[PDB]
RNA sequence: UGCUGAAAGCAUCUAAGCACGAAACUUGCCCCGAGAUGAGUUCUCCCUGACCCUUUAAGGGUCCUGAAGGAACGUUGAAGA
RNA sequence: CGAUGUCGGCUCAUCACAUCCUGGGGCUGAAGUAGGUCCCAAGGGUAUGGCUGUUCGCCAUUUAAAGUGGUACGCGAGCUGGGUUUAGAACGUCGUGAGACAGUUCGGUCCCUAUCUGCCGUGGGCGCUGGAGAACUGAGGGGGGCUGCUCCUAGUACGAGA
RNA sequence: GUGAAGAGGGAAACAACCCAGACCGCCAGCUAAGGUCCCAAAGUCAUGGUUAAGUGGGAAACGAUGUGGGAAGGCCCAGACAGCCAGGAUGUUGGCUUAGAAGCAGCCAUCAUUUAAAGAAAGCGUAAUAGCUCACUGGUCGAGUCGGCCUGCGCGGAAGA
């Protein structure tokens, strides 16, 4: 089934009547407007493309402005589309609310993780550091050996080395949905989700049922 | 070869149709359709069935021999059918049946359900004996084998599911 | 957070006063023991008249930790020292007759009934 | 099941069979005479 | 491990045919991915004025127009050498 | 021999299967739990300490297991320098002696700013053909794949009992 | 003999293996070893056989109703081989080493009746017994069947970074 696009809004905890406190991530899921519906006849697959939020009138380009005007949908920030499960249908211009998550229990949240920049092997791949004393010289956090000898004669592809860490989309799956608030457009999910505050997130029902 | 050179008499009230190499036989139980090997030719041979190996196949005689056995099996099945008897040995063993599904409890923590295929009927005259009937011998043998595989007989008490007409070897602990 | 080579006090009156943890049980490559995990210890100094002598290896259960324990609502319990209770290596069975100091309720595993009963508090 | 390289008719009730290019010995009296590689 | 089954009247898991059968294999889960030069698909937006020249060609030169959009610059960022 | 640094340790690994564990099976002198042996299986996993420079090994306590090998007995332009293997000194022994001893002790400089291949990241150029802004399909590639204990079934099947 | 001190063609690459000894030029022809489906020049050429294994295109002792051919031999419509309802008994619980070996541990003969037909004993199984089979013998269908030798080509044996 289709997901929804929301914005991460900090974190909080919910106190239950029995005493236990549930850490919850707050996701602001306002109305999602369908801008385009894809069908097997034309696109070879069925999907719905949705938009959310708002954009400055002078900031949206003409190609994007015409695309929204065709669907009669107010311009929003970015576009995302979700594949259909063959059991439901949608129409252009339809608005989708967070209420569809009322009957679900597990969700999958996808977002861009925080960017750590160029990271070393110790931080990136949990490499073990070498001794800080006992004669060690300029080799306290160095990766160490990266190959065997002449017989391979090369470093194998996929070697773990320092490089860019974070700033890629990652998915946290099977997260418990704690509360849904349609009128206030909130979705409380137990746990933590990728990305920093204000980052766009995609929420869909858990697939590992 | 030798078996192939032995036509089988078709009893009255049985319809045989030869569509190319496909054979359809209708008796009193149902229509049985079987595709035959390309290396064997069959003619109506009114009142009988005959099989001949076409030239150009080294194993032509063998394919004829197995073909004749298959045709006889279907002829017997449609005329009368095939029945197999299975026995359940062991305290607390039930073999209740209802509709098209067999329920068994072979000492497992959960019930065992078996979905019989089309054209197979199961009856339970007694709580431990189950009898299966059908129009062809291959399917009944397969179904009975599937039923037996659930709890193979073991050679200390002869428990589990066994065929009505088989002998199960038994052995005893020598010292301990 | 009890790991190998850690000093522990003895809550019971078995005669031991200080023990060394030499192994954390319950898993391969386990790092440190929690609130109520079984550990293997060696006695470093005990009462001469006690039933347990120095330099003997026997199991033990942690009852108090300096690091503390976390409650489901976010609360924590912390102590000024680490304490344990002695065992029998075949059946858990704390050999002590009385245990001093508070004991947390995390040990209620349908089994440590003897420990909790002897506990002056909780 | 013996996986020896040499197969023989250990008893009278032993039959030589070929299955999937593998020569097997099947006995209907005692399982101890069943052997695979031939 | 089998069902049926001849060669070999029997038997036989196999030769024809039909069943099951493992953390292995393919998929299912997550991520990258059309430089996939085999460079894909869909949606939307913008440009529809004149002169001449020759070895008259998917040719060259001049005037007027240069849109969508992009870049640059600035303020910057939970993005970043 | 106009120079290929040769034992251990650390970091980082990768492959084979003659499999240590987990998975699927045959036989058993397999009652059950637990075993013995053989076949299929390399997806993942596959200890911490004391003594010694040690690999190994003995010992202590864990785990489902603490697998066997290849890779310059993997890896010093990645680290250490304990052993061995310069110059000092001493002991035992051999020699008249200088000295010698896979005999033993004390002490004893480990250089390199990366051109190319490779690998981990991240950009520019052009192409994909009128140009431009977006959203995708997905060929193909990679990551992940471990498992203990307790309870129910049941104290059931099995067993004279345990 | 070749290389060293010899190029050229062939064996994928490969001084020393096979063919063959380069005076120079030619967009001429015929051959050697080796080859002729495509990479890649030339037979998807002709005739008669073999192989089912990717054998060909690594490897042995040894194992096996794989398959082709040859020379024979025993039994066979006074009817064979495999199947099918049948029979397989009486002392020989033996004297013998009497502990029980009684056919199924051996000293031992290896007798004898009913007989269409049976042995003082071949297998499994009992402390020995018992018991179940096969040797052998009747009846139906009924035609070939059985065990060795010579070998052609194949299969297993056959696991490494």
GROMACS .gro file of N, CA and C (backbone and C1' of nucleotides) in nm, chain G residues 84-117:
model
  238
  872C        P    1   0.512  -6.553  -0.695
  872C      O5'    2   0.373  -6.618  -0.737
  872C      C5'    3   0.264  -6.537  -0.778
  872C      C4'    4   0.150  -6.619  -0.831
  872C      C3'    5   0.106  -6.737  -0.745
  872C      O3'    6   0.023  -6.700  -0.637
  872C      C1'    7   0.128  -6.808  -0.969
  873C        P    8   0.063  -6.739  -0.486
  873C      O5'    9  -0.027  -6.867  -0.454
  873C      C5'   10  -0.148  -6.854  -0.380
  873C      C4'   11  -0.240  -6.972  -0.401
  873C      C3'   12  -0.197  -7.104  -0.337
  873C      O3'   13  -0.227  -7.111  -0.199
  873C      C1'   14  -0.263  -7.143  -0.560
  874A        P   15  -0.114  -7.153  -0.093
  874A      O5'   16  -0.096  -7.310  -0.114
  874A      C5'   17  -0.017  -7.360  -0.221
  874A      C4'   18  -0.013  -7.511  -0.223
  874A      C3'   19   0.097  -7.576  -0.141
  874A      O3'   20   0.063  -7.592  -0.005
  874A      C1'   21   0.098  -7.666  -0.359
  875G        P   22   0.178  -7.603   0.107
  875G      O5'   23   0.247  -7.744   0.078
  875G      C5'   24   0.178  -7.865   0.101
  875G      C4'   25   0.262  -7.984   0.063
  875G      C3'   26   0.395  -7.998   0.136
  875G      O3'   27   0.382  -8.059   0.263
  875G      C1'   28   0.431  -8.024  -0.096
  876G        P   29   0.454  -7.996   0.392
  876G      O5'   30   0.609  -8.024   0.368
  876G      C5'   31   0.656  -8.157   0.348
  876G      C4'   32   0.797  -8.156   0.294
  876G      C3'   33   0.902  -8.094   0.385
  876G      O3'   34   0.949  -8.183   0.484
  876G      C1'   35   0.925  -8.007   0.166
  877A        P   36   1.008  -8.127   0.623
  877A      O5'   37   0.952  -8.229   0.732
  877A      C5'   38   0.816  -8.223   0.775
  877A      C4'   39   0.754  -8.360   0.784
  877A      C3'   40   0.834  -8.464   0.862
  877A      O3'   41   0.816  -8.454   1.002
  877A      C1'   42   0.762  -8.557   0.656
  878U        P   43   0.942  -8.466   1.102
  878U      O5'   44   0.949  -8.621   1.137
  878U      C5'   45   0.844  -8.684   1.209
  878U      C4'   46   0.844  -8.833   1.186
  878U      C3'   47   0.970  -8.908   1.225
  878U      O3'   48   0.975  -8.938   1.364
  878U      C1'   49   0.903  -8.975   1.009
  879G        P   50   1.092  -8.877   1.456
  879G      O5'   51   1.110  -8.983   1.573
  879G      C5'   52   1.224  -8.981   1.657
  879G      C4'   53   1.323  -9.088   1.618
  879G      C3'   54   1.470  -9.048   1.622
  879G      O3'   55   1.526  -9.055   1.751
  879G      C1'   56   1.423  -9.156   1.417
  880U        P   57   1.684  -9.032   1.772
  880U      O5'   58   1.721  -8.921   1.664
  880U      C5'   59   1.838  -8.842   1.678
  880U      C4'   60   1.865  -8.760   1.554
  880U      C3'   61   1.742  -8.706   1.481
  880U      O3'   62   1.692  -8.588   1.540
  880U      C1'   63   1.892  -8.803   1.324
  881U        P   64   1.559  -8.591   1.630
  881U      O5'   65   1.599  -8.508   1.760
  881U      C5'   66   1.712  -8.545   1.837
  881U      C4'   67   1.734  -8.452   1.953
  881U      C3'   68   1.838  -8.496   2.054
  881U      O3'   69   1.970  -8.465   2.014
  881U      C1'   70   1.642  -8.427   2.167
  882G        P   71   2.068  -8.582   1.962
  882G      O5'   72   2.062  -8.692   2.077
  882G      C5'   73   2.017  -8.824   2.049
  882G      C4'   74   2.130  -8.912   2.000
  882G      C3'   75   2.268  -8.883   2.058
  882G      O3'   76   2.286  -8.937   2.188
  882G      C1'   77   2.284  -8.913   1.824
  883G        P   78   2.406  -8.885   2.281
  883G      O5'   79   2.522  -8.992   2.258
  883G      C5'   80   2.501  -9.129   2.285
  883G      C4'   81   2.587  -9.217   2.198
  883G      C3'   82   2.737  -9.189   2.204
  883G      O3'   83   2.800  -9.249   2.316
  883G      C1'   84   2.669  -9.206   1.978
  884C        P   85   2.927  -9.177   2.383
  884C      O5'   86   3.031  -9.162   2.263
  884C      C5'   87   3.136  -9.068   2.269
  884C      C4'   88   3.154  -8.998   2.136
  884C      C3'   89   3.244  -8.875   2.137
  884C      O3'   90   3.381  -8.907   2.130
  884C      C1'   91   3.044  -8.826   2.021
  885U        P   92   3.475  -8.895   2.261
  885U      O5'   93   3.471  -8.740   2.297
  885U      C5'   94   3.388  -8.691   2.401
  885U      C4'   95   3.445  -8.566   2.463
  885U      C3'   96   3.365  -8.506   2.577
  885U      O3'   97   3.388  -8.571   2.701
  885U      C1'   98   3.425  -8.335   2.426
  886U        P   99   3.270  -8.582   2.810
  886U      O5'  100   3.139  -8.610   2.724
  886U      C5'  101   3.029  -8.681   2.779
  886U      C4'  102   2.899  -8.643   2.711
  886U      C3'  103   2.837  -8.511   2.756
  886U      O3'  104   2.894  -8.399   2.691
  886U      C1'  105   2.672  -8.681   2.754
  887A        P  106   2.951  -8.276   2.778
  887A      O5'  107   2.821  -8.200   2.829
  887A      C5'  108   2.752  -8.243   2.946
  887A      C4'  109   2.687  -8.127   3.017
  887A      C3'  110   2.575  -8.057   2.940
  887A      O3'  111   2.451  -8.124   2.951
  887A      C1'  112   2.724  -7.896   3.028
  888G        P  113   2.332  -8.093   2.847
  888G      O5'  114   2.394  -8.128   2.705
  888G      C5'  115   2.314  -8.183   2.602
  888G      C4'  116   2.248  -8.076   2.519
  888G      C3'  117   2.300  -8.059   2.377
  888G      O3'  118   2.246  -8.154   2.287
  888G      C1'  119   2.283  -7.847   2.480
  889A        P  120   2.340  -8.266   2.221
  889A      O5'  121   2.463  -8.183   2.162
  889A      C5'  122   2.478  -8.163   2.022
  889A      C4'  123   2.405  -8.040   1.976
  889A      C3'  124   2.446  -7.985   1.840
  889A      O3'  125   2.385  -8.052   1.732
  889A      C1'  126   2.434  -7.808   1.998
  890A        P  127   2.457  -8.178   1.662
  890A      O5'  128   2.337  -8.280   1.636
  890A      C5'  129   2.239  -8.304   1.736
  890A      C4'  130   2.099  -8.302   1.679
  890A      C3'  131   2.073  -8.195   1.573
  890A      O3'  132   1.979  -8.244   1.478
  890A      C1'  133   1.931  -8.158   1.758
  891G        P  134   2.030  -8.319   1.345
  891G      O5'  135   2.093  -8.203   1.257
  891G      C5'  136   2.219  -8.219   1.193
  891G      C4'  137   2.272  -8.087   1.143
  891G      C3'  138   2.260  -7.970   1.239
  891G      O3'  139   2.364  -7.966   1.335
  891G      C1'  140   2.183  -7.905   1.025
  892C        P  141   2.380  -7.839   1.432
  892C      O5'  142   2.455  -7.732   1.342
  892C      C5'  143   2.472  -7.598   1.387
  892C      C4'  144   2.459  -7.500   1.273
  892C      C3'  145   2.429  -7.356   1.313
  892C      O3'  146   2.545  -7.284   1.351
  892C      C1'  147   2.282  -7.422   1.141
  893A        P  148   2.579  -7.263   1.506
  893A      O5'  149   2.737  -7.243   1.508
  893A      C5'  150   2.823  -7.339   1.448
  893A      C4'  151   2.963  -7.331   1.505
  893A      C3'  152   3.061  -7.437   1.456
  893A      O3'  153   3.118  -7.404   1.330
  893A      C1'  154   3.073  -7.423   1.691
  894G        P  155   3.143  -7.519   1.221
  894G      O5'  156   3.247  -7.617   1.292
  894G      C5'  157   3.272  -7.747   1.240
  894G      C4'  158   3.364  -7.825   1.330
  894G      C3'  159   3.373  -7.975   1.303
  894G      O3'  160   3.460  -8.006   1.195
  894G      C1'  161   3.344  -7.939   1.534
  895C        P  162   3.475  -8.159   1.146
  895C      O5'  163   3.561  -8.227   1.261
  895C      C5'  164   3.578  -8.368   1.266
  895C      C4'  165   3.625  -8.413   1.401
  895C      C3'  166   3.609  -8.562   1.432
  895C      O3'  167   3.713  -8.641   1.377
  895C      C1'  168   3.526  -8.436   1.613
  896C        P  169   3.681  -8.741   1.256
  896C      O5'  170   3.578  -8.660   1.165
  896C      C5'  171   3.515  -8.720   1.054
  896C      C4'  172   3.403  -8.811   1.097
  896C      C3'  173   3.288  -8.827   0.998
  896C      O3'  174   3.316  -8.918   0.894
  896C      C1'  175   3.202  -8.788   1.215
  897A        P  176   3.320  -8.870   0.741
  897A      O5'  177   3.236  -8.981   0.664
  897A      C5'  178   3.257  -9.119   0.689
  897A      C4'  179   3.138  -9.181   0.757
  897A      C3'  180   3.009  -9.186   0.675
  897A      O3'  181   3.006  -9.294   0.584
  897A      C1'  182   2.961  -9.102   0.891
  898U        P  183   3.006  -9.267   0.426
  898U      O5'  184   2.897  -9.153   0.406
  898U      C5'  185   2.766  -9.166   0.459
  898U      C4'  186   2.702  -9.032   0.483
  898U      C3'  187   2.662  -8.954   0.359
  898U      O3'  188   2.538  -8.995   0.305
  898U      C1'  189   2.777  -8.812   0.508
  899C        P  190   2.530  -9.113   0.195
  899C      O5'  191   2.502  -9.244   0.281
  899C      C5'  192   2.427  -9.237   0.401
  899C      C4'  193   2.394  -9.374   0.454
  899C      C3'  194   2.263  -9.435   0.405
  899C      O3'  195   2.273  -9.496   0.278
  899C      C1'  196   2.274  -9.454   0.640
  900A        P  197   2.155  -9.480   0.171
  900A      O5'  198   2.025  -9.531   0.248
  900A      C5'  199   2.012  -9.667   0.286
  900A      C4'  200   1.889  -9.690   0.371
  900A      C3'  201   1.756  -9.647   0.309
  900A      O3'  202   1.705  -9.742   0.218
  900A      C1'  203   1.769  -9.572   0.533
  901U        P  204   1.587  -9.702   0.116
  901U      O5'  205   1.454  -9.746   0.192
  901U      C5'  206   1.327  -9.727   0.132
  901U      C4'  207   1.218  -9.715   0.236
  901U      C3'  208   1.092  -9.642   0.191
  901U      O3'  209   1.003  -9.726   0.121
  901U      C1'  210   1.163  -9.557   0.401
  902U        P  211   0.953  -9.687  -0.027
  902U      O5'  212   0.842  -9.576  -0.002
  902U      C5'  213   0.715  -9.609   0.052
  902U      C4'  214   0.628  -9.488   0.068
  902U      C3'  215   0.625  -9.392  -0.051
  902U      O3'  216   0.537  -9.434  -0.154
  902U      C1'  217   0.660  -9.269   0.147
  903U        P  218   0.573  -9.562  -0.244
  903U      O5'  219   0.531  -9.518  -0.392
  903U      C5'  220   0.621  -9.449  -0.476
  903U      C4'  221   0.629  -9.302  -0.440
  903U      C3'  222   0.709  -9.215  -0.536
  903U      O3'  223   0.633  -9.176  -0.650
  903U      C1'  224   0.774  -9.168  -0.314
  904A        P  225   0.671  -9.231  -0.796
  904A      O5'  226   0.659  -9.102  -0.889
  904A      C5'  227   0.543  -9.020  -0.885
  904A      C4'  228   0.575  -8.877  -0.922
  904A      C3'  229   0.685  -8.811  -0.841
  904A      O3'  230   0.815  -8.843  -0.887
  904A      C1'  231   0.498  -8.667  -0.852
  905A        P  232   0.922  -8.910  -0.789
  905A      O5'  233   0.956  -8.795  -0.684
  905A      C5'  234   1.042  -8.687  -0.718
  905A      C4'  235   1.075  -8.602  -0.598
  905A      C3'  236   1.128  -8.677  -0.477
  905A      O3'  237   1.266  -8.706  -0.485
  905A      C1'  238   0.959  -8.526  -0.410
   0.00000   0.00000   0.00000
